[PDB]
A paper describes a structure:
ACC is then oxidized by the ACC oxidase (ACCO or ACO, referred to as ACO in this study), giving rise to ethylene, carbon dioxide (CO2) and cyanide3. ACO enzyme is a 2OG-oxygenase ‘related' enzyme that belongs to the cupin superfamily, which uses a non-heme ferrous iron (Fe2+) as a cofactor and facilitates the integration of molecular oxygen into a myriad of biomolecules. ACO uses ascorbate, rather than 2-oxoglutarate as the co-substrate, and requires CO2, one of the products of the ACO reaction, as an activator. Overall, the structure of AtACO2 resembles the Petunia hybrid ACO (PhACO), featuring a double-stranded-helix jellyroll fold surrounded by α-helices.
Among the compounds tested, only 2-picolinic acid (2-PA) directly inhibited the enzymatic activity of AtACO2 like POA. Notably, the inhibition effect of 2-PA was stronger than that of POA, while a known ACO inhibitor, AIB, showed much weaker inhibition effect than POA in our assay. The SAR analyses identified 2-PA as an even more efficient inhibitor than POA. In the presence of Zn2+, POA and 2-PA bound to AtACO2 with dissociation constants (KD) of 10.2 and 2.8 μM, respectively. We subsequently co-crystallized AtACO2 with POA or 2-PA in the presence of Zn2+, and determined both structures at 2.1 Å. POA and 2-PA bind to AtACO2 in a similar manner. In both structures, the Zn2+ ion is coordinated by the facial triad, including His180, Asp182 and His237, and binds at a similar position as Fe2+ in PhACO. POA or 2-PA in turn binds to the Zn2+ via the carboxylate group and the N-2 nitrogen in the pyrazine or pyridine ring. The carboxylate group of POA or 2-PA forms a polar interaction with the side chain of Lys161. Lys291 contributes to the hydrogen bond interactions with POA or 2-PA through a water molecule.
Residue numbers in the entry:
A (entry chain B), C (entry chain F), E (entry chain C): 6 to 303
B (entry chain H): 6 to 69, 81 to 303
D (entry chain A): 5 to 303
The structure:
Amino acid sequence: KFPVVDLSKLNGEERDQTMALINEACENWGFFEIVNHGLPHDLMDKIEKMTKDHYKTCQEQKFNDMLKSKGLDNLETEVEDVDWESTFYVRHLPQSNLNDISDVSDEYRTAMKDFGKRLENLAEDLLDLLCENLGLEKGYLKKVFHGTKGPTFGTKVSNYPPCPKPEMIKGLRAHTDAGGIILLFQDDKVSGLQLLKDGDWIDVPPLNHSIVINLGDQLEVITNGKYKSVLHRVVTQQEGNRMSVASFYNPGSDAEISPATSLVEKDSEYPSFVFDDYMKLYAGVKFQPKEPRFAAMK
Amino acid sequence: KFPVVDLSKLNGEERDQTMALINEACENWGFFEIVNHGLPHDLMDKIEKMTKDHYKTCQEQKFNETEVEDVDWESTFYVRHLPQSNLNDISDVSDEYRTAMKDFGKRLENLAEDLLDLLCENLGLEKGYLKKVFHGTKGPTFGTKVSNYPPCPKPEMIKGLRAHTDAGGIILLFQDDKVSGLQLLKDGDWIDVPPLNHSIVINLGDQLEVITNGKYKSVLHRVVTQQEGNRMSVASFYNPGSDAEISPATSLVEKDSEYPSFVFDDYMKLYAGVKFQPKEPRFAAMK
Amino acid sequence: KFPVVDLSKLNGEERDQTMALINEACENWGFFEIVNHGLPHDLMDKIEKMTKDHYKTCQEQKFNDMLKSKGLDNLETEVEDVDWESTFYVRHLPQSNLNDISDVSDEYRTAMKDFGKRLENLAEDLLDLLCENLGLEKGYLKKVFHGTKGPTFGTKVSNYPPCPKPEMIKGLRAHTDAGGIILLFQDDKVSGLQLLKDGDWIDVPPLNHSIVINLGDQLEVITNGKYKSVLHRVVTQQEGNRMSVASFYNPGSDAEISPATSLVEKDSEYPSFVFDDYMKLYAGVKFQPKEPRFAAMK
Amino acid sequence: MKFPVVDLSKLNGEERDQTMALINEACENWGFFEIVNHGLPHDLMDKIEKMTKDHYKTCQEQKFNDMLKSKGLDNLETEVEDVDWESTFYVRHLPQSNLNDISDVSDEYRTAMKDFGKRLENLAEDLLDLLCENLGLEKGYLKKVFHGTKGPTFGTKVSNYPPCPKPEMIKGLRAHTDAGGIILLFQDDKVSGLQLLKDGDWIDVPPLNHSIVINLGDQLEVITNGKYKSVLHRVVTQQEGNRMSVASFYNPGSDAEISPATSLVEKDSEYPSFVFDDYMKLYAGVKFQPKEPRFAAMK
Amino acid sequence: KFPVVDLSKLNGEERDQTMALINEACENWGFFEIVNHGLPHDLMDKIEKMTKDHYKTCQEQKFNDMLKSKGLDNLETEVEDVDWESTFYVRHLPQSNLNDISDVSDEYRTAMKDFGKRLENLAEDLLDLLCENLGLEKGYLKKVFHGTKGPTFGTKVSNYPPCPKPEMIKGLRAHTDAGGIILLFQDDKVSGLQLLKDGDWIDVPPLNHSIVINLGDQLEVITNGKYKSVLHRVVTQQEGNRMSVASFYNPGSDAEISPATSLVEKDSEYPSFVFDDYMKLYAGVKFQPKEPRFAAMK
Ligand SMILES: O=C(O)c1ccccn1
Ligand SMILES: O=C(O)c1ccccn1
Ligand SMILES: O=C(O)c1ccccn1
Ligand SMILES: O=C(O)c1ccccn1
Ligand SMILES: O=C(O)c1ccccn1
Ligand SMILES: [Zn+2]
Ligand SMILES: [Zn+2]
Ligand SMILES: [Zn+2]
Ligand SMILES: [Zn+2]
Ligand SMILES: [Zn+2]
């Protein structure tokens, strides 16, 4: 059963049990859903509606332009080198480009700014729960992530349109995320996101007004492997356009990333590096195995 | 006019003038300061902070009447980065200091190689030539000497470090930005290497004098003490590998060279015993 | 782009450009940094070393005993009524108390006296540049500031020690300065001082051997609002102790302060008052809005 | 992208700051603006307009048709880029008035023109003082700069743009920037035609009853060190409609020294320092060529 | 310092800095000289000799004829409506008229043909360097320029003979060029060509065996203003006849010109049009301001 965490149970004497659920999702799933997370359901509903309307208005034509430009009109053999995906990226931190994206509406930009700020505070709240579960001092992960200019925080807004031949192409090929903590607002009707657990692909179930959390490669390093970043993918379907609004809380470019000493006894197998060196490498090898990227930092 | 090179001026119309200043420093100064070098000022501030605080906790107590010309008024420990790091084996260094030194050392190694490629361009050598010469079998040798020069009641009796030339390739110095002391010998005068915030001091060692057939000479330098003030020094040495073959680059030689061809580790074995004696007998000894 | 004025550029016709830059900073920034100001760099280096050593020797434990008496160990909630600040004050004029600060060395007292005299001369040179830019006669501002016993001149020696939770407390809360012209020798590594400009907090960047200049409330009155006194604050940080040696060149206590008539066309909105009445009021309301203090002098 | 209209009566009251800020925005971003409630009597504007239009019909229209005949512009077979489809005469007010020397004007027109020009000269100097305040200059700075030895130069160009059968072949007045200081235009309130270039589009300066159109010339671009630029403008023709134009030019005296104001120059200016009459002698010959070479020619 | 680019440094490890110089000249100068290009120095020397000998035998007559019918033998005052210039035009593409110019020699035509082909290939190589510097796809600008019949490529062969009173008339009045990329073989002793930069006329220095490159109006549109076409002129002198062999690589007549979408964020201020409509208009208004010609294409 996929972990669903009720964050409102942290405000009372059920808080220890909630923390234990968070910790075991972090150790064994790499993913969990959160409900009662404090984000207004009214804000999620308009983010959802304006994301979908901005797709028809602005992204659908770019998407078909892409399928023509790569011959994906007609899928007669398996395509393992492209994602059946429509995306644009919004940067929040350290410097916002929200007011420079030309094709987004005023009210969409205002909703995205509010949504991004609330998710940034929720990311930092979640990192503190991780710290507590890890036996780290409060604020430890936030301070590691800061670097010189503060954390990097952006939002990937994706749609995975219907695919006539889902067997032939993935919406997004299997990978682990490079960063710190990932907070996903996904479609509540159209499924597609899957994680790999114990040798099976497991669906990340659509759930109304929920946020999906998962941990990236940097948290595997800092926890000395105690919390691993898990492989995940998006599969297409013939009917349905799955919406994806995923926010990435990453260390600053010059943050020093290393295994926390209190989590290391035997010499660590994980490297110590500067985050931007990891991200330069990751961009070119995102869909290749994760383990060579750690070795490359030594 | 001590040369200060602005590395941000390399991308542009003004790059020819920046390169000419670098070349002119290499030929006639043997030293130059670089600013806007790409190293984060917050990493330098941490390095300086932890270096000075590591002195007071670990070295200052341990550190505790006529001319003394055979001793250096100096407190030092050494960190090895390449070919193989001993950073996790220096006992008296803290985790934050060790993590900062690893990051700082990696950035200085990349900056050293960028500087070697600027030298190559000014010398008319192909890019990567000096890096390739320095590699040997195991790669270049790269380490950092962390020094403090504490106050001396009688500075005219003892030097912080006696006059010498450096044996190796290129030296990248992060020095105190308030307390002076480092001097180079130029045209028969001792010249101060001026403290400058968030700068790196570059100087060339004996190996680059050989490879350039004397076009860039390694210059004598020293550290003088002072009565008040503890000058910090974080100096990184980018050296050829032990079995690198060092010889004058053929394109810089027309008339037969006066400089020898040798293997770097034979020069270093010799250098250790005669570091404060004249440089010129060390070149002759390699023939 | 924060104004940095090179005082060596007064010696040509760059002088017009330099004067125009000073005027622009006075009108729109309220702050500017000066370089090549004539203060010996070796005297500044001594002042800094001795201030930092006097903090460690005399104030750091005194400071730590204060956070116990005021419960600032645990910053579990926001503190808006205290400054995370260690200070003492040195009065130079009209009457010196330099020989009464008990825990300072002969050599610190002798250096501070020399430093103070040089800053007093630089303050008066700067006031004459303001006079020229305003079209006032030479010495106009010095004469207004004189009163009967001469200007008031003192130095505030501050350190802002590291704060575990900088989000909770300011090093010094937002305020404008009551006085005439303020000449600040600040830490050249540790930032923290910010001014408010166009609705944003802007850092006053550390710059080695520079002096930071800002204008106080009295100059806003004399210029009939042409040069306004700008809000500024000091923020803390988690690792770094920012030093501040700030000298205040203020009118004499019984000086008559009023808008210079040549700067007044329409009847002024600013009061005419005696400086000590302004200062007696300011002491109690320093971190409250500035504008009621002008109204209270009518 | 609304054309700026400034209510000058709002300077007399609590909204003076907001009005000054609007004027400053128009000076930086449009180079043109319309003013209303400007103090010129609406009945004097009506008489000027009536007498200008009747003087065209009785005295200028025959000359205009005869001008085309002599240049063969009866037949707009192809584009004309070197002629203005324009009927004009010029009235000099300062430093020396020639009003009593124009032969074909009535005494009533001459008296109204003298009264109109005097009020416009006073309004020009009032506006220059608003610019001074917005620029941080001393009161009267621009008037003092413009004075030279004999005072400012002030004249009025009285133009009509008669109907043109083929407007796409010829402009009423080709694109240019004005050489001088501040230009105060009383234009037709029905017939449009004046356009300015803004952000790569021609923008109509909309006819507005009893308004005055203000624009800034090349000399104020120099003095403000480029903060207020002189903007390109033109007059287009139409097939029917005769647009009237009464435009007054407040210019520095001939021997006035023009340079960027010292308080606006924090680094070396790209703009020259020169004597105004040298700029004008050059401008007369290259008025419809680019502006920027004229600044370079003064160095 | 006027930009001089060594094109042989593109074949090696200095190529990035060479590209950076090209991009800098394109953004800030609109002009640059190239050395070590592909053109044999003996071909340039022969083009220069035969151009100058063709002036004396064939063009000097037409030039004095011109001065006759325009009354320009004696220059009492400024002439602002004519150029002190002797020209004939050679068309190469889409169709050559080289074998139809009656007064050109066999060997001049053969040299002119070889010269034109090498400059056409150098124009296309240079356009690809601009593409790379602009982040456009390889061949992008050549494809835009093609239309139906291919690019237009021609050569303007000019001489600017000595003028007794150079103050009175220009060799060629200030203008921007209408087309794509302009490749000039100019006199290496007699100067005269100037560009306008930062409010100053700057000489384009004569240099042995060099080619002067500048960008026309079409590249400003396609780059959305990132590379502007800059005003330039030729001044006369009393002693000296400056030679000018200028080759113009322009889009085909029916090419669609518009800002490249990857260079546009906010709505472009530049029009989208068909090139021949721009050229029809330009011919009549060449020496009037540039900006109204862009406005006219909307
Ligand atoms: O696009 C991704 O890589 C993604 C999106 C949401 C959650 C995890 N990963
Ligand atoms: O210790 C040395 O020999 C040294 C240190 C820094 C720079 C140059 N030389
Ligand atoms: O303590 C203050 O109020 C202060 C200090 C330095 C500069 C400005 N203001
Ligand atoms: O005739 C002109 O040049 C003019 C007329 C009115 C307004 C601006 N310019
Ligand atoms: O004749 C021209 O317009 C020209 C000639 C060469 C270079 C630029 N422009
Ligand atoms: Zn992912
Ligand atoms: Zn050394
Ligand atoms: Zn203050
Ligand atoms: Zn005009
Ligand atoms: Zn041209």
